[PDB]
Amino acid sequence: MNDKHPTPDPAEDNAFFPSAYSLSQFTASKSDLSGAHYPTPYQGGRWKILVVGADERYLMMDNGTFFSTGNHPVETLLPMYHLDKAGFSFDIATLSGNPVKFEWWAMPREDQEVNGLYSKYQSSFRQPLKLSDVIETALGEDSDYIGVFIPGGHGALMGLPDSQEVKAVLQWAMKQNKFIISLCHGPAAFLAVGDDPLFAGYKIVAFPDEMDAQTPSIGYMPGHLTWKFGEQLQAIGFELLNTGISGQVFQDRKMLTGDSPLAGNALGQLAAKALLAEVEQ
Numbered sequence: 001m002n003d004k005h006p007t008p009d010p011a012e013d014n015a016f017f018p019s020a021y022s023l024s025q026f027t028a029s030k031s032d033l034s035g036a037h038y039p040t041p042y043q044g045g046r047w048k049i050l051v052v053g054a055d056e057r058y059l060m061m062d063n064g065t066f067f068s069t070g071n072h073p074v075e076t077l078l079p080m081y082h083l084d085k086a087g088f089s090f091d092i093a094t095l096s097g098n099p100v101k102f103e104w105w106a107m108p109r110e111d112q113e114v115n116g117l118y119s120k121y122q123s124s125f126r127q128p129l130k131l132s133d134v135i136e137t138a139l140g141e142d143s144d145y146i147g148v149f150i151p152g153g154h155g156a157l158m159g160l161p162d163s164q165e166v167k168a169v170l171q172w173a174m175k176q177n178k179f180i181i182s183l184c185h186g187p188a189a190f191l192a193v194g195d196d197p198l199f200a201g202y203k204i205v206a207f208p209d210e211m212d213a214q215t216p217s218i219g220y221m222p223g224h225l226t227w228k229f230g231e232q233l234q235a236i237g238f239e240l241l242n243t244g245i246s247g248q249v250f251q252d253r254k255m256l257t258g259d260s261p262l263a264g265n266a267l268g269q270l271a272a273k274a275l276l277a278e279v280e281q
Contacts, residue, residue: 019219041087053100054155061223072153082268152184183258200237
């Protein structure tokens with residue numbers, strides 16, 4: 001209950017969920033979903049959003065342990081919930097085709113709306129598309145995709161940040177003037193652009209590296225990250241706006257970001273406002 005020892009995951013060897021103590025501080029039985037009310041949504045039936053989820057749950061720490069992670073389900077479903085109320089569909093993909101892996105220990109078991117949205121979309125989360133297939137068939141200059149969404153959670157740190165596929169999706173989104181939507185550890189995906197000065201000068205919010213440095217001290221993670229996405233992102237031209245976390249978001253042109261597992265509702269609101277304005281015109 002106050003125990004700060006990481007909790008062992010029985011599915012995998014030397015792999016740990018967050019500690020009981022850290023769970024009682026960073027997770028909650030209900031989300032803060034609110035304001036998802038759009039008196040005139042989009043009813044064209046055309047525009048939908050492409051979600052790029054994490055396909056791995058086990059992230060390797062600097063001490064040889066696995067952190068039992070993945071996408072954060074609040075960060076994932078709160079923005080989708082707003083966009084859904086706004087009249088948009090989603091297609092879900094992972095790099096491998098393998099099912100999207102969420103931090104279930106973070107899922108609010110008492111939030112009816114959040115669990116509602118998920119039962120609606122579980123089949124796509126559980127049998128996602130394969131990003132290569134989406135890229136080959138569903139992009140180009142007249143896509144039905146109005147933008148790409150990259151949820152956070154430490155699962156976003158695996159595969160995505162050096163994937164040549166994400167690179168294609170980001171390059172596509174930029175050249176077709178499309179919305180890019182991310183929060184927390186999700187912006188690590190942006191590093192997939194490699195040496196491309198594509199995002200130079202862009203301003204975002206993201207989980208602060210120094211908080212990642214500190215959270216193991218209570219057993220949130222069974223070790224430390226082997227690298228720092230914050231410093232890399234700055235190294236490719238991004239300007240990180242936030243020293244701490246507060247649920248904050250920011251819009252730089254069509255780039256929409258949130259700072260932490262607190263920013264889900266706000267990112268939903270932001271994206272809904274922005275995309276509704278895009279399509280009503």
